[PDB]
Design a protein around this ligand. Structure first.
Ligand code: A1CHO
Lengths: 625, 300
């Protein structure tokens, strides 16, 4: 089902209206809390002393109804940024009055318009309201794609509508939101109610609202086209935008009178329900990821921390990862031991970081289909996983698999390996210290020995997400640096965001590394061409790995392994967001840094303006060796 | 008729025989509706029991006007233009059409020269020309970029009318032109419009700052009121006087030079409509949200 509401500016009887609105199938009602034509005075007598009541009784609905079914609306005569001081002072008093009555009723949301450039005093009054009491109401800023001035009929002789293109001018209503949003200091309680016009703007105007906290999409009845049978439908361009908004799980608001008078009003809502069915169903990935959209998590450190039973369980359920590892070992065995040497040559396989042994099983499944004899070592640091390995070794594997309870950098190998096999990769590939671990294990690989994986490469892309910026910003803990949350990466299913430029490679590691001087420290300058006006909030991280030859895994969106859910993207946020105009280049600088105890990332933006260097000396974030 | 009428009096209009039309809204309390009333005795008003006719509407009255002598055109909060008619006895008021064509509150309405067509303004920003016989919208005009505050039909021209909005535009209209609107001039938002009844190419406009202005279509202005000018109505004289309303709760009456002749702070709330009697040209009836029907003797 789709969560939908009715917008009314006429409610004669709140009881009858809500019953009708509920019967039509709407989940909530957007209505005025004071009569919208009822202008009030707060200074000049005699209008100041108008006898009450000033609006309806709170007793006309149950508490539950106010909290769930009602959305408040600001009376449209309230103009806090009026050039007339008398209208300014009254609109202030009226705005507080109506907002305070919203809080009194316990309404879940309240609608305020952004219908002009200057909303500075509107922002001041709301911001002051947010800091007065312990109330919990959301604030839906009602803003259109296209400003009414830029869609007025060209019917004024001596004031014609501009034909010459204005790329910045067509994005004016986003700048209204940005300024208001910025003045109110990115309040979690201030979201967008995006009003869809009859004629949509250019894609760049629509793309501008990617990454923005859209809680509502307002659909006027006027925008709906009639079909042969007489029902309201939408254009394919409109349908395409509704499909995008359904992914963001926004609430739909129907506004205006029934322009399809011949048919029932349900018809409008029925068409949204119809479109909600006719979207493509969620794939295996999108089903698994369902729940984790823009949820910030600490990147795992399986070297420093011992992973839990249920953590290994989750990661074993990824079918693609292990089928690819199986295929990679399968291809490596046949390349190493030919048909004639089959029964003579036994290959020494070593699973380095074996967990509960899904790569052990994959190594065994690979050996049977390859039809080549193998001796297995299962090296695991975590002694709780080692319990699971040894119970498997006794009951199933036997003497073929040798369970070792050791760090792979410490372990004195009885014999050298033909293939070393590992799954030490993070969301940024090297962020769980696969380079350091395999470097220390390298000495007990043969001179001609293979590493699986053989190669991996990280990728960075700049993103706009005021949603995620605000989400990061709210991870401030007591008893630490109050900007430390901005100087550490998070693993997150990036959902409400905008990728400002194509991902480019960051850091690459090869195994084995036969370098006379082995240094895993890195420095990488990246230049990202940006084709849009936007605001940078951080960089999305991804990776690709070569397991063996053609056999690969990837979470690069453009080369992503189908159905593979073991790694969500990683996010590197920035303390202060950076304005980026069309044509400009975002220049970012990433360092991989280390001593004997710690490994960490430092990063900075150098174009089009400079950020501070983030996480200097790993002051906010380190990865334990 | 209804048992009791609503506190907020929005409209007051005299026809030829001197019968007073009243529109009312409930802008506060349980029910937010409105009503229409006829008073053959104007001194009796606003007393409900001693009235000729009275009817309940679905929603509030934002504005109304007479259609000839019998019909009543009504701007509804519902987003509907409503036409009511008196019976032959003029005892009941019956609905003729109630068409929901505006997407927000209908704010202003005015009857054209012919009396067979009317123009409406709404918060949905659009202006609509009606056929009162066919009960349909001939033209839907989205000229403005904000609320349509006031629409005033030309006295002696069926194709011409003024409109003004919170986009700070005063538009002269002529439906004969392929681009029918024309922007006149501003500064402070225009809030009220009135054509000069004798001089065809002259009108007056009141702004939100309380300034009444005289305009020749081919400018004189006075700071009359201390708040928004709600309404402007010319007297029925050959040399007409100008009544001016405001949210400062006062009435003024002004000469050709916009000079103050009369003043009344008799209302204790917003003054909403003025209407000059055709029987006695010196008498002027005002209505406000204080629920007063005050009859003024203008020193003419
Ligand atoms: N982003 C992700 C996602 C899923 C992951 C799944 C697994 C194992 C699924 O079966 C692992 C490996 C975790 C293993 C390695 C072992 N480890 C790490 C250093 C090290 C030194 N010497 C010996 N073992 C050592 C660590 O104890 C754990 O058991 C990482 C994943 N990363």
């Amino acid at each position: 089902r789709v969560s939908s509401g009715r917008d009314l500016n006429c409610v004669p009887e709140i009881a009858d209206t809500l019953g009708a609105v509920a019967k039509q199938g709407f989940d909530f009602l957007c209505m005025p809390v004071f009569h919208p034509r009822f202008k009030r005075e707060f200074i000049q007598e005699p209008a100041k002393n108008r006898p009450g009541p000033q609006t309806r009784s709170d007793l006309l609905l149950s508490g539950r109804d106010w909290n769930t079914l009602i959305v408040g609306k600001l009376s449209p005569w309230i103009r806090p940024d009026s050039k007339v001081e008398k209208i300014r002072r009254n609109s202030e008093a009226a705005m507080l009055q109506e907002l305070n009555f919203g809080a009194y009723l316990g309404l879940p949301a309240f609608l305020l318009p952004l219908n002009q450039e200057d909303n500075t005093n509107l922002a001041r009054v709301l911001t002051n309201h947010i800091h007065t009491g312990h109330h919990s109401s959301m604030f839906w800023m009602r803003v259109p794609l296209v400003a009414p001035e830029d869609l007025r009929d060209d019917i004024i002789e001596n004031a014609p509508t501009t034909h010459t293109e204005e790329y910045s001018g067509e994005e004016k209503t986003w700048m209204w939101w940005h300024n208001f949003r910025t003045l109110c200091d990115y309040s979690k309680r201030i979201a967008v109610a995006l009003e869809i016009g009859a004629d949509l703007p250019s894609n760049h105007v629509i793309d501008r609202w990617l990454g923005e906290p859209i809680k509502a999409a307002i659909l006027p009845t006027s925008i709906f086209l009639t079909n042969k049978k007489g029902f309201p439908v939408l254009s394919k361009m409109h349908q395409r935008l509704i499909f995008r908004l359904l992914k963001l799980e926004v609430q739909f608001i129907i506004t205006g009178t029934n322009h399809h008078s011949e048919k029932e009003f349900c018809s409008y809502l029925q068409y949204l329900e119809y479109l909600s069915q006719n979207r493509p169903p969620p794939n295996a990935y999108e089903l698994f990821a369902k729940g984790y959209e823009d949820y910030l998590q600490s990147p795992l450190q399986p070297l420093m921390d011992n992973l839990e039973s249920q953590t290994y369980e989750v990661f074993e359920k990824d079918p693609i990862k292990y089928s690819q590892y199986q295929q990679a070992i399968y291809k490596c065995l046949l390349d190493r031991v030919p048909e004639e040497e089959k029964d003579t040559n036994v290959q020494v396989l070593m699973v380095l970081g074996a967990g509960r042994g899904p790569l052990v099983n994959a190594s065994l499944r690979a050996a049977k289909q390859a039809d080549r004899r193998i001796k297995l070592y299962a090296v695991e640091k975590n002694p709780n996983a080692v319990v699971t390995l040894e119970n498997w070794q006794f009951e199933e594997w036997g003497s073929q698999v040798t369970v070792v309870s050791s760090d792979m950098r410490e372990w004195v190998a009885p014999e050298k390996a033909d293939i070393i096999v590992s799954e030490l990769l993070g969301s940024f590939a090297d962020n769980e210290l696969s380079p350091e671990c395999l470097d220390g294990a390298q000495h007990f690989l043969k001179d001609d020995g293979v590493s699986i994986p053989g190669e991996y490469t990280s990728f960075l892309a700049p993103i706009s997400s005021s949603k995620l910026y605000n989400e990061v910003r709210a991870c401030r803990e007591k008893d630490r640096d109050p900007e430390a949350q901005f100087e550490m990466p998070y693993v997150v299913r990036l959902h409400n965001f905008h990728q400002l430029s194509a991902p480019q490679p960051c850091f690459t590691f090869s195994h084995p590394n036969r370098d006379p001087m082995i240094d895993n420290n890195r420095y990488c300058t990246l230049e990202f061409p940006v084709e849009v006006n936007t605001v940078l909030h951080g960089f999305a991280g991804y990776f690709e790995t070569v397991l063996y030859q053609d056999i690969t895994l990837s979470i690069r969106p453009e080369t992503h392994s189908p159905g593979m859910f073991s790694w969500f993207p990683i996010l590197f946020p920035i303390k202060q967001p950076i304005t980026v105009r069309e044509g400009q280049t975002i220049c970012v600088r990433f360092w991989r840094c280390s001593n004997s105890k710690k490994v960490w990332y430092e990063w900075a933006v150098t174009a089009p303006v400079c950020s501070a260097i983030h996480n200097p000396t790993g002051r906010s974030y380190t990865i334990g060796l | 008729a209804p048992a009791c009428m609503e506190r907020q009096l929005e409209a007051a209009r005299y026809r030829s025989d001197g019968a007073l039309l009243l529109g009312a809204s409930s802008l506060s309390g349980r029910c937010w509706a409105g009503s229409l009333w006829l008073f053959k005795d104007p001194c009796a008003a606003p007393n409900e029991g001693f009235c000729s006719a009275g009817v309940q509407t679905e929603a509030g009255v934002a504005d109304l006007t007479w259609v000839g002598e019998r019909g009543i055109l009504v701007a509804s909060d519902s987003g509907a233009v409503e036409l009511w008619e008196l019976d032959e006895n003029e005892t009941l008021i019956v609905s003729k059409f109630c068409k929901y064509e505006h997407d927000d509150i209908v704010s202003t309405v005015s009857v054209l020269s012919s009396g067979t067509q009317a123009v409406s303004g709404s918060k949905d920003i659009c202006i609509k020309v009606w056929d009162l016989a066919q009960q349909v919208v001939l033209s839907s005009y989205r000229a403005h970029a904000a609320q349509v505050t006031c629409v005033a039909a030309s006295p002696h021209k069926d194709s011409v009318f003024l409109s003004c909005s919170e986009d700070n535009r005063i538009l002269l209209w002529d439906t004969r032109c392929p681009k029918p609107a024309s922007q006149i001039g501003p500064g402070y938002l225009p809030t009220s419009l009135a054509w000069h009844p004798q001089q065809s190419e002259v009108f007056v406009f009141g702004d939100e700052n309380g300034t009444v202005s005289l305009v020749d279509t081919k400018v004189l202005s006075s700071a009359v009121h201390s708040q928004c000018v709600t309404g402007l109505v010319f007297s029925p004289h050959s040399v007409p006087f100008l009544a001016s309303l405001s949210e400062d709760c006062s009435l003024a009456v002004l000469d050709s030079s916009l000079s103050e002749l009369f003043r009344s702070q008799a209302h204790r709330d917003f003054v909403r409509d003025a209407t000059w009697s055709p029987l006695n040209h010196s008498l002027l009836t005002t209505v406000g949200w204080d629920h007063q029907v005050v009859h003024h003797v203008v020193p003419t």
